[PDB]
């Protein structure tokens, strides 16, 4: 609240300093921001405690940055950490005390939890509460009465208005409890699903699963893990532990196929007990319990084919022990979020690898599913070797003079097609691909503009893939990339970042970017995180190049796009010039070729 002569807020008169400040490695700002030391001997204990009570926002190598909020404190209470149980240790760890503001915030957030519980039974959602005064003073606003369908006091609530009531309670200061007591539940018989000994659970996976199962009752929340870290395995383990009917929701055909494959590989459950509620193919969804389907189908708003209507009615009628949702970052979308209310589930677990978006709808996930239970430390995984180390780099390509002339002259938005296609970046990508090809490194080129992708691919006679590409040709190209030594590069379009199971690649060049999309950046980066059989963290075998054009809007987009990665800790090294480019022969070495490319770009319209 107090501002120094500079921008930083003043806290000299706010909180004191502990005498043994050197011993205490923890800081506590009044706003809730906490700065932990990664060099302290008790760093591991401090990390565990701060991860338990707070969500990371920036975890560089030296000083980690966390911030706590109501959702994080509710998650702490869910895993069973009381207000004293957290605040006493927070004061002990803190080297400068705990401000009264944070003290009262923690007390209020902890006490305002568990008073209101939401439990669905016999397809009816009852708002139970041991304390009756909570309901007595909660029925002040008319929205509760209109929403409601027309000790231990409970009342039934309308299915459709659950989301509205939950978001209302969040700001009403009485969070709802979504814990599932699968251990004590006889209404829905347990499913015959077990985890085979073959599956191996990594320490971070086990920690995330523990945070989810803080107690005997499973907690509904979101666990963010890298795509290469085995989030599919974590979800399968969660379903197996729940031992009740599980509905996994993918985002595409590839996602559902991969989910079925993961289920069969890691769970002893028989093949016949798994169904694919997919329009392309179905396996008698009503027949078995464990189901894999898609948001588009479940939230489909237009006409429903009679068979799918029967399946949808069956799904609505039945109650699901677990609702796994992969790629939760798309949930807050209108149709996708409608699925949450369409289907009934005790706990709706969420898994993803890029929980970031521009529109401020990510906060809605906290109530749509639950608090962010776990968020894996990418740097720690890199050190442990579970994830391939990546030498993140941004190659600056100076824009050609004529191209810059037209780009600046035109105030329209042909610049997206223009600066994405310039001779300098073309030569840079050509030279980089040549260097990695002679180095036997697998290349996955990326480009949002299909026009630019096709032009580059024809000029380099490479197998570009994109949306309306035939599925058979897509599979053939991927198989050739994985097996044929003569080819070691594939030019994938935006479809690549959506969802795929692609072979591990040693480099990932991105000539063009869709825009300031942290989601796309992280999605494309996750491709090369696949750990090799015998690599090492320090070898930096994996490389990521984000080619950008100097003095162009692409620079702003790249800087706005690398925020999530830098927050994780990746250091994007800038490359102004590439050694050997002048000696190496490359296309567009003369003014004329740039002229024809510019003419084609202009005629593109």
């Amino acid at each position: 609240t107090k501002v120094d002569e500079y921008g930083a807020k003043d806290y000299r008169l706010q909180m004191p300093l502990k005498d043994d400040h050197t011993s205490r490695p923890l800081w506590v700002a009044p706003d809730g921001h906490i700065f932990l030391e990664a060099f302290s001997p008790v760093y591991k204990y401090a990390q565990d405690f701060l991860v338990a009570i707070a969500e990371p926002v920036c975890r560089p190598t030296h000083v980690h940055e966390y911030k706590l909020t109501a959702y994080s404190l509710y998650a702490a209470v869910s895993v069973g950490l009381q207000t004293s149980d957290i605040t006493e240790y927070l004061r002990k760890l803190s080297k400068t005390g705990v401000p009264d503001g944070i003290m009262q915030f923690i007390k209020l957030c902890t006490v305002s939890y568990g008073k209101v519980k939401l439990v669905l039974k016999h397809n009816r959602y009852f708002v139970e509460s041991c304390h009756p005064d909570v309901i007595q003073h909660l029925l002040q606003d008319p929205v509760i009465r209109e929403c409601r369908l027309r000790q231990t006091v409970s009342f039934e609530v309308k299915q459709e208005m659950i989301e509205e009531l939950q978001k209302r309670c969040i700001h009403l200061e009485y969070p709802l409890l979504a814990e599932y007591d699968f251990r004590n539940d006889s209404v829905n018989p347990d499913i015959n699903i077990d985890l085979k000994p073959t599956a191996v659970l990594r320490p971070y996976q086990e920690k995330s699963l523990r945070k989810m199962f803080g107690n005997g009752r499973a907690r509904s929340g979101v666990i963010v893990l890298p795509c290469g870290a085995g989030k599919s395995l974590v979800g399968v383990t969660a379903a197996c532990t729940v031992r009740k009917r599980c509905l996994v929701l993918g985002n595409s055909a590839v996602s559902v196929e991969q989910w079925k494959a993961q289920f069969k590989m890691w769970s002893t459950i028989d093949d016949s007990q798994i169904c694919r509620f997919t329009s392309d193919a179905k396996d008698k969804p009503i027949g078995c319990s464990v189901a894999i389907s898609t948001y588009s189908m479940l939230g489909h708003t237009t006409k429903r084919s009679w068979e799918a209507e029967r399946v949808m009615e069956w799904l609505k009628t039945q109650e699901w022990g677990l609702m796994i949702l992969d790629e939760v970052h798309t949930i807050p979308a209108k149709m996708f979020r409608r699925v949450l209310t369409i289907v009934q589930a005790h706990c709706k677990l969420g898994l993803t690898a890029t929980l970031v978006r521009e529109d401020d709808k990510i906060v809605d996930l906290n109530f749509l599913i639950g608090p962010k239970l776990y968020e894996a430390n990418w740097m720690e995984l890199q050190n442990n070797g579970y994830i391939a180390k990546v030498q993140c780099a941004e190659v600056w390509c100076p824009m050609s003079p004529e191209f810059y002339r037209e780009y600046v002259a035109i105030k329209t938005k042909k610049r997206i097609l223009l600066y994405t296609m310039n001779p300098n970046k073309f030569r840079a990508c050509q030279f980089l691909i040549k260097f990695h090809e002679r180095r036997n490194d697998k290349i996955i080129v990326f480009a949002d503009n299909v026009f630019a992708l096709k032009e580059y691919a024809i000029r380099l006679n490479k197998p570009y893939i994109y949306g309306p590409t035939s599925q058979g040709e897509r599979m053939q190209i991927l198989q050739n990339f994985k097996h044929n030594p003569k080819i070691n590069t594939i030019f994938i379009s935006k479809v690549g970042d959506t969802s795929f199971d692609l072979p591990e690649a040693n480099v990932l060049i991105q000539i063009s970017s869709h825009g300031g999309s942290r989601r796309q950046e992280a999605q494309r980066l996750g491709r090369v995180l696949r750990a090799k059989k015998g690599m090492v963290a320090e070898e930096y075998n994996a490389f990521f190049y984000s080619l950008v054009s100097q003095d162009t809007q692409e620079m702003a987009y790249s800087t706005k796009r690398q925020r999530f990665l830098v927050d994780q800790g990746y250091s994007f090294k800038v490359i102004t010039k590439l050694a050997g480019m002048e000696e190496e022969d490359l296309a567009f070495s003369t003014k004329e070729e740039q002229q024809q490319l510019l003419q084609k770009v202009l005629a593109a319209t």
Binding site: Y45, D48, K211, F213, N215, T241
Partner: peptide
Amino acid sequence: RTKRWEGGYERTWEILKE
């Protein structure tokens, strides 16, 4: 037959005392 996760949180910091 329950799993280790159902037991409870590890509470890794509880070991340290001052």
